[PDB]
# Entry
Amino acid sequence: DVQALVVDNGSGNVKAGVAGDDAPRSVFPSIVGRPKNPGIMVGMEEKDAFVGDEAQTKRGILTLKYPIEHGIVTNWDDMEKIWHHTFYNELRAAPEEHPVLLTEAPLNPKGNRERMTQIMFESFNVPAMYVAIQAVLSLYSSGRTTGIVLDSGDGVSHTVPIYEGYALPHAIMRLDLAGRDLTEYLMKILHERGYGFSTSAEKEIVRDIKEKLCYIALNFDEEMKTSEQSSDIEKSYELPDGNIITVGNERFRCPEALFQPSFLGKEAAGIHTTTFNSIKKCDVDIRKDLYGNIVLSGGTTMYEGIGERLTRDITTLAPSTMKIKVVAPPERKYSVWIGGSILSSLSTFQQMWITKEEYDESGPSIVHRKCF
Amino acid sequence: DVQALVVDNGSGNVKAGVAGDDAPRSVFPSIVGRPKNPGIMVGMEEKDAFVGDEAQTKRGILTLKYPIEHGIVTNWDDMEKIWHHTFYNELRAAPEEHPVLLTEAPLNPKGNRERMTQIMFESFNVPAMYVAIQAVLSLYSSGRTTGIVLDSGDGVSHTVPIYEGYALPHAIMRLDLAGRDLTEYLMKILHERGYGFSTSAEKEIVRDIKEKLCYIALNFDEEMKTSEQSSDIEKSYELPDGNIITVGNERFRCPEALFQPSFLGKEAAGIHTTTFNSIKKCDVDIRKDLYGNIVLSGGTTMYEGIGERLTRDITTLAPSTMKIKVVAPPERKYSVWIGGSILSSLSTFQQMWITKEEYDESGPSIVHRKCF
Amino acid sequence: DVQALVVDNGSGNVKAGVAGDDAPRSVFPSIVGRPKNPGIMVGMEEKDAFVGDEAQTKRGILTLKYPIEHGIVTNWDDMEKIWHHTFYNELRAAPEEHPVLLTEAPLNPKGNRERMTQIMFESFNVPAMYVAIQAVLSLYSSGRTTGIVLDSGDGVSHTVPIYEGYALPHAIMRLDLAGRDLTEYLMKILHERGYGFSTSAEKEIVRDIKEKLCYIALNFDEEMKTSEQSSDIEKSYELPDGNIITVGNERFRCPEALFQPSFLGKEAAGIHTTTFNSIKKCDVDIRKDLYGNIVLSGGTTMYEGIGERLTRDITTLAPSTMKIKVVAPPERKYSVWIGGSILSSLSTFQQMWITKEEYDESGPSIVHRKCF
Amino acid sequence: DVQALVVDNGSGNVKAGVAGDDAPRSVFPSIVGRPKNPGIMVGMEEKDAFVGDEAQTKRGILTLKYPIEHGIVTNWDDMEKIWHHTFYNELRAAPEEHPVLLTEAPLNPKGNRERMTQIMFESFNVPAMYVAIQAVLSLYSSGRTTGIVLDSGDGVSHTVPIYEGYALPHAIMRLDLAGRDLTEYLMKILHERGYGFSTSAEKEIVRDIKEKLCYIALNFDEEMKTSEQSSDIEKSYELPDGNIITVGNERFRCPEALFQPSFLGKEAAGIHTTTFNSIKKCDVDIRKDLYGNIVLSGGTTMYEGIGERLTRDITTLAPSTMKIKVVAPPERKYSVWIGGSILSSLSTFQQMWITKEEYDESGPSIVHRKCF
Amino acid sequence: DVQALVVDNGSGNVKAGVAGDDAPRSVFPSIVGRPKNPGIMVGMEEKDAFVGDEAQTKRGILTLKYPIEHGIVTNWDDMEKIWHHTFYNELRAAPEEHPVLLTEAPLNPKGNRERMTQIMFESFNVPAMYVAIQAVLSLYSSGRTTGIVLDSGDGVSHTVPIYEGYALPHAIMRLDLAGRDLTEYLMKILHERGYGFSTSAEKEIVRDIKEKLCYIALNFDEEMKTSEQSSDIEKSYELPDGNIITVGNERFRCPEALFQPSFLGKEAAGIHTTTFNSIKKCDVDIRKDLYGNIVLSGGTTMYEGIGERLTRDITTLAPSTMKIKVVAPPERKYSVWIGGSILSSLSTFQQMWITKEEYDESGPSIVHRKCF
Ligand SMILES: C/C1=C\[C@H](C)C[C@H](C)OC(=O)C[C@H](c2ccc(O)cc2)NC(=O)[C@@H](Cc2c(Br)[nH]c3ccccc23)N(C)C(=O)[C@H](C)NC(=O)[C@@H](C)C1
Ligand SMILES: Nc1ncnc2c1ncn2[C@@H]1O[C@H](COP(=O)(O)OP(=O)(O)O)[C@@H](O)[C@H]1O
Ligand SMILES: Nc1ncnc2c1ncn2[C@@H]1O[C@H](COP(=O)(O)OP(=O)(O)O)[C@@H](O)[C@H]1O
Ligand SMILES: Nc1ncnc2c1ncn2[C@@H]1O[C@H](COP(=O)(O)OP(=O)(O)O)[C@@H](O)[C@H]1O
Ligand SMILES: Nc1ncnc2c1ncn2[C@@H]1O[C@H](COP(=O)(O)OP(=O)(O)O)[C@@H](O)[C@H]1O
Ligand SMILES: Nc1ncnc2c1ncn2[C@@H]1O[C@H](COP(=O)(O)OP(=O)(O)O)[C@@H](O)[C@H]1O
Ligand SMILES: [Mg+2]
Ligand SMILES: [Mg+2]
Ligand SMILES: [Mg+2]
Ligand SMILES: [Mg+2]
Ligand SMILES: [Mg+2]
# Structure
C-alpha cells in the first residue's frame, strides 16, 4: 500500500523520512530564529523568521528559541512553522496523500496529544494519523520483545520495562534531566577558567564543545585525583573567530550530573538508581530477564564510557548472582525512528490508524482510546 | 482390544496417559492463567488464557486460578479448557475412539459426577466412560486385597478400609486438610522472619520451598527444644531474582499441622487419629489384618520421616500385642494412576463401561447405578 | 499508682500523651529532615537534623525521610531521634519514672518487637513496658466486646474479628495499601492536567490536596459518566506561592483504589472483599454478630462517603437476611490512642507489664511470652 | 582587641576603613593617571603615576585607566599601586598588624581570587585574610536572614537569594551591565544634541551629568509622549569652562537600558526579569518569603524612582496574591562595607580567617577551601 | 521613470551628477571666497562672492572659507550658495523636476538633517528627497552584502560593519581626524626647514604638496633610521612663483598621524585600532567574514602603501588563524557617489523617497522616520 511518513519530534532535533528506509532523510535542529537588527540593503531577501539549518548558519544576527521544552510544546505557532518546514521543504511530500506516524514521551499531559491530532487533521489534512511511545519504538528496533529501554535525549529521560510483549505501565519512570541541562551546567562551570557564554548563539558553541570533548569516568573520586596530578587531561578547542580555549576537569565533571543530580541542585536520583527502581517495581519472576537486556537509546547515551559505568553501578545495586548486560548499539541515536519505520510497515498495523472519518465523528479526544 | 485413556484429575495436578503403561505420560498443574496487563507489541500471539505448564512459565504477567477446590469442581468452563488441553495437546489422542476412565474422591456431591458424565458424553463424544474411587485404585496398584489406604493430595485426605475385596462403606472417613492448607500455613508463618508473599505467583514459590525444605519430626516438643539450641536447623533458598532467604523451625512446624490441625484453627483430628477411628469402625475380627497393611499414597505423604511418626502414633493408640506396619512404596505419587491403568485392562472389567447407548437411553443419572 | 505514657507510633504521625486523658497532647509527623544546602550566615543555629513539626515548617531547604514503612521500622537511628524528641520535647516527662505503652500492627516480624523492647529498656531506662495491637485498642475505645475492626492509616490496612472478648487469630487479614499509596497515585495521575510534583516537599503538598479535595463515590461508573457531563465537579486550590490549580475526576478516582487495587498495579482485593473474607473465615454461629458491628478506625477512613459505600458493597456480598451496620464514630482518628489510655488504667491490667527485672533476667525475647 | 581592615574593591570606587565603625573612612575613585605631556618647569615634583583623588584633580593633563573591568582585575601592577595608596596614604595603618577582609562578586574566575591572596600574603605581609561575597554582606547589613539581594555598582549586577541563613547557589544570576555601560550609552546618545565627548576626562564629566540629571520613569512609553508635548523636561548644566548644555529625553532614556538591554545591543534580560527568574529557580515553599524582602544595594540603584518601577514590574510578573515589597534604604551605597564591618567583628568569625601558617603550608589555593 | 540627481556633499569637495552614470559629472572644492581688497578698474565685474573652481583660480586676492567642518554644516548661507552653484551652473538641471539624493556621516546631530530637508523642500522646491549614509553606499558600490567599510575623507573617519545586509548600529565608530588635520600638521612641521605658510591660499598649496609627495611607511621606527643615512628621501617642489623647496622626513611623518594621533596632541586611537575595536564589538560568529572584507573608501586612503600597513597591523592585532584581506579599489575616491547612483536607480527603492505631500503634512521631522 501507500507508504507512511515517520516524523520523530524531539526537543533538540527533528528526524523525518519515509517508512521502509534504514535511516531518516532529514535531521535538523528544532529552532526558530528571528532577526534582532534592522535590514538596510535594498534588494535583499526579507524574511520574518528562519527555521532549521538556515537559522543555524546565520545565528550571528538572530535570536534562537526552542518551541519544545521537556517534551512539552510551549509555543504552537513555532511548532506549526517547524512542521510546515518539515513537510514542504525537507521531505517535499504532500501530507494529504500519506499517513503520518508521530512520537511522544510517556506521562505527558493530554492536551499535548489532543492539540497535535487537531493540528494534523485540520491544518495539514492528513488521511490517517497515529502517536506512539518512543521507548517502545526503540525496542521494536532492537528486535526483541523483552527488556527495559533507557531513553535520554535533550529534554526527558525515561525507562519503560516490557516482558514478552506486555506493558508494565505501573513501572514507568520519568526524569526531567537531559542534554540541555548538561549544556547549561557546562556553560555555568566554564566560568571558573575565565570563559563567559551568555547568548543563545554561544549556547550552540558550548553544546558542540560538550559533544566533542566530554566523557564519562568509571570512578569519579579517583579521576578527580588522577587528573589533578598531571596535565594530560587538558584539550584545546578553536572558536569560530580563531581564539583557543583549554578545558580540564570539565570534560568529565559535566556528564557526572547524570549520576549525581545534586550538582544541578535537583532532589532526584541518577539514571542508574532510576533504572534499578524501575526494575524492582516489577514482579520477582521477571526481573531476571530485565537485568540481561538493558537497552540504551538517545543522543545523551553516546558519551564515551557510559556502558561500563552503568554496568558497574547496577551490578553493585543488584544481587551477586544476576547477570547484568547493557547493550549499546551503534546508530542508537536513530533507533526511535527506525522502530517507527518498522512498526508503520507491518501488515497487522494497518487497522490501527486513526482515520479522518473517526475524527470527524468524535473530535480530537479519540487519541486517548486508540493510541494509548 | 482398543486401549483406554486414564485421566487422574487432582486438585493440584493432572495425571494422564494410556492404559497398559507403567507411568503416566503427561503430568502438569491444573491451572488457568489470564493476563492482567495490556499487550502492546504488534505481531505477538494474543491468547485469552494459558493452561498448564505454559501458565507456569509466564506467571509473572498472569493471574493464576485453580478450577478444583477440595475435590469439587468450582468452575466448569475452566475444567473444560483443562480437559481440552489434556486431550488434544498433551496426549494427542482422539477421545472419540477410546473409552475414558476418570477418578473422584469419596463422599462428594452427586452433581459433580453428573456434570462430569454429561460433559464427557456431549462435548467430547466418548464411546464409553467410568468413574472410580482413587483410594481403591491405589490398592489395585498395591497388588493386595486387604488393607486401609490413606490418600492425601492437594485438597482431600481420606481413608478407605477393604477386607478381601469387600467394601466397608460405613468406615470411610474424609478430612478437608491437605497440601494446599500447608502451603497457606507456611506462607502465613514465614512473616515472622520478615518475608512477605501475597500474589498467586509467589504462592507457587512458597510451594517449592515447602517441597524442598520441609520434613516431619519424630517428636515435636523435643525437636522444638533441640532446634533452639544450635543453628544446624537453618537452610538457605535462592529466589528467582537472586535473593537469599533462610528458614529454621518452619521446616518441621509446617507439616506438623497434619497431626495437630489446631495450628490452622480447625476442630478436627490428625491423620493418625483419623486412621485409628476408621479401623475401629470395623468388625473386631478384621482389625488385625488392617493394622498390618496401612498403605500411603499421594503427594502429601512424600515428606521425609512420615512413616516412622505414623507407626509410632498408631502403635501408641493400638493395643500392645498388635503389629502395626505402614508401607510407603516409592512412586506412590502415581499409584492411583497405576491402579487405574491396571483396572482398565482386566478382561472382566470390559462389561462395566457406561456405554453411549445407555446414556442416550437414561441420561446422566446412570452414573449412580453403574458406578459407586 | 503512677500514670503511664501512651505512645501510638504510626507510619505517618506520632500520637502521644498521658493515660487518663480524653485526647493525646502531642500529634506531629514522623519525619526527619536534613539540610541539602550549606549554611553561610555566621551566627545561625547549626543543627544537623530536624524532627517533627520543625521539619515541616522549613521543608524548603530540607530532604524529608520517613523511618517507618508499612508498619516496619527501616532506620532505627531516626526512630531513636523521633522517640527522644517525643519524650523530652513534646511531653516533657522523664521515661525513667513512667511505664510506657506501645502499639504495633499484626503479622509483623519479630525483630521489630525485640529491637523496640531493647531500645526502651537500654536507651531510655523505663521501669515497665508493653506492646499492644492497634485494632484491639480501637475496640477497647468502642466500648464493646464483639465486632470486627477495619483499621487503615498510612502504611497498613488490617481487620481483626473478636467475639465476646475472645480472639480469632486465624481470621486476621492484612493489606499493604493505605494513605501513602493513595498520595503516590494522586501524584502520578495529576500529570494528566499538566502538574508535576517530584520532590519530598511537593509530596506534602499533594497529601494536603488529597485531604482537602478527595471523596468516595457511591457508584464509580455512574460518577465517571456524570462528571463528564458538566463542570460542577471541578475545584480550585492555591499553592504556597500563589498559583492556582484545578482538579476534576481525580477527586474520586484517587480513593477508588481502596476498592479496586488494580489501579495501582496490584494483585489484591479491596477492603470490602477483605472484610468479607475475614468474616467468612469465622464460625457460622458468630458471623451474625460480626455483620452488625463493623467498626472503622484510622485516618484513611475519614473520606466523605465511605460508610455508605462499604455498607452497599458488603450488603451485595452478604446473604439477603443479614443486617449489615458500619459504625464510623467521630474522632476515630485517635481511637487507638483512646483505647490504649483506657487499657493502661485498668486495675486488672497492672500485672501484665513487662518489668525491668524480667528483662534483665531473660533478655528481649520475653516480648513473645508476655505480649501477643 | 586587634581590629580588622575592611576593604571593598569595586570597579568604580574603593571603600576602606576600620572594623567597628558605622561608615568607611576613605572613598576615592579606583583610577591610575599618567601624564601625556612633557614637564618643562625645572624645580617641579616629578611623578610617574597619580592615584585616586589626585588623578581626578589634574585630569586635564593625564590619561585615565581603570584596572578593574566587570569585577575582574585586568592589570595587576596598577592594582598593587591602588592597594599601596589605600594602605599607606588613606588609612595610614600597617597591614602587617591587622587582618584584612576583601570582597568579590560571585561567579568570578578563580585565578583572580588566587592572585588576591598571593599578593596580600607576599607583598603586604598580612597576618590573616578573608574574601567574602558582596551581596551576602549587604544582607548582613540589612539585619535579616531571608531575602534576595540585587547588587548593582559600576561593573556587575547580580542577585543572590538566601532563606533562613542558607545559601541557594544554583539560583545565583549574574549580569554584565552596570553604571559604566550607562555612562557610555549616555555619551553616545548626547551626540543627537550636538555634544561630543571622547576622552577620559570628558567621560568623567558625562558620569557627573548622569549622576546629577538622570531618573527612572514609571511608564516609558507614556513618558516618551508626555515629554514631547512641553519643555518642562529640559534641564541645564554648566561645564568646567563656563559653557551651558541642555538635556531632554536623555534624562530617562539613559537608565531605561537597565530594563531594556537591547538599547545597548545586548541579548539579555532586564534586572526585573533577572530577579524574577532568580526567584523562580528556588523551591515553591520559599518564594513567598523572597517576594516580601527584595533588598537593593549599590550605586546604580540610587536613581530616583527605581523602587516603584521594580515593584510594578515584579507585581506584573508574579501571581496576584503575592505581596511584593522592595526595600531601598538610605546608605545603601555603603551597605556592603557596613555588612563586612559587622561580619569581621563577630566572636564566632575569629576562627575562619586564613592564617599565614596555613598559606605557607598549602599555597594560594587554600582560598577555594576556606572561602566560598 | 525620471532619473535622480546624486549629490555627495563632503567637507572638501562636492561630487554631483545624474543617476545612471559611471562617474560624477562635476567635482569642485566646497569653498566660498570673498575679495579682501577694493576694485578700482571701472568696467569690471563686481561680484560679492566666488564659489567653487573660480575661487581657486583667483585665490590671490580672496579669503577662503569652508562652510562644512567635521561633517557638520557651520554656515548655512554659504551652503545655500554652494548648492545653488551646483544646481544651476555645474549640472544645469532644474531641481523642481528631479528627485535628489544626499549623503551624510553617521552619529551627526539631528538639526543637520532637519535643516537640509527644510532647505531642499522650501528653497529649491524638489519633488522628492532622501538622505543616506556614505559608508553604506560604498558597500553598495563594492557589490557585496558583508564587510566593514573604513571611510576617510577630509573631515571624518568612520567604520560601519554589515553582515548579510543587516546593520550593526552598536558597533559604528567615528573619529574626528582626517585629511584636513594632516594638512595642518604638515603646514606646522614644515617650519623646521624654514618654510612658513600662514594664509588660506598657502594652505591650498600645502595640500597639493601633501597630495604629491607624501606616502605611508611600512615600519616607522626603521624608516626614521634608514632615511637618516642618505638623501634618497629628498624631493623637490616648485612654488607658483618659481621658488624651489625640498622635503625629507615630512613625506612619511605627516600621514603617520593616522596611526599615531598623539603627534597632533590627540587622545585617540589610530585607524587600525579603531577598525579592530569595531570588529570586536560584533558577535563571535560574524568576525570571520568581516576580517576578510575590509573595504577602503575616500581620498585619505589614497596614500601609497596604506593597504600593506593596515594588513600588517590588523594581522598583528587579530588571532593567527584568521585571514585578513584589505581591498583597495581603484576609483575608490568616487565609490560613495557610485553607490548612491546604484541605489537611486533600483526598482525597489522607488517607494522610499520622502515626497512633498508627506513633508507638507509632517514638517521637516519626517527625516527621522523615513531615513535610518
Ligand atoms: C570565551 C570567549 C572568549 C575569550 C576572551 C577567549 C580568550 C582566549 O579567553 C581569555 O582571554 C580568558 C580571560 C580571562 C580573564 C581573567 C582570568 O583570570 C582568566 C581568563 N577571560 C576574559 O577576558 C573574559 C572576561 C569576562 C567578562 Br567581560 N565577563 C565574564 C564572566 C565570567 C568570566 C569571565 C568574564 N571575557 C572577555 C569573556 O569571557 C568574553 C565575554 N567571552 C566571549 O567573548 C566568548 C563569546 C568567547
Ligand atoms: N556525541 C555526543 N556525545 C554526547 N552528547 C551528544 C552527542 N551527540 C548529541 N548529543 C546530545 O544529544 C542531544 C540530542 O539528542 P536527540 O536524541 O537527537 O534529542 P531529541 O531526540 O530529544 O531531539 C543534544 O542535547 C546533544 O547535546
Ligand atoms: N516431595 C514432596 N514433599 C512434600 N509435599 C509434596 C512433594 N511433592 C508434592 N507435594 C505436595 O503434594 C501436592 C500434590 O499431590 P498430588 O498427589 O498431585 O495431589 P492431586 O492428586 O490432588 O493433584 C502438592 O500440593 C504439593 O504441595
Ligand atoms: N481528612 C482526611 N481525609 C482523607 N485522608 C486523610 C485525612 N486526614 C488524614 N488522612 C490520611 O491518613 C493518613 C494518616 O492516618 P493515621 O492513622 O493518623 O496515620 P498512622 O498510620 O501514623 O496512624 C495520612 O496518610 C493522610 O493522608
Ligand atoms: N546618585 C546617583 N545616581 C545614579 N547613579 C549613581 C549615583 N551615584 C553613583 N552612581 C553610579 O554608581 C557607580 C558606582 O557605584 P558603586 O557601587 O560605589 O561602585 P562599585 O562598583 O565600585 O562598588 C558609578 O558608575 C556611578 O555612575
Ligand atoms: N592622492 C592623494 N593622496 C593623499 N591624499 C589625498 C589625495 N587626493 C586627495 N587627498 C585628500 O583627500 C581629501 C579630500 O577627499 P574627499 O574624500 O574628496 O573629501 P570629502 O569626501 O570629505 O569631500 C583632501 O583633504 C585631500 O588632502
Ligand atoms: Mg528523542
Ligand atoms: Mg490425587
Ligand atoms: Mg495508626
Ligand atoms: Mg560594589
Ligand atoms: Mg567623503
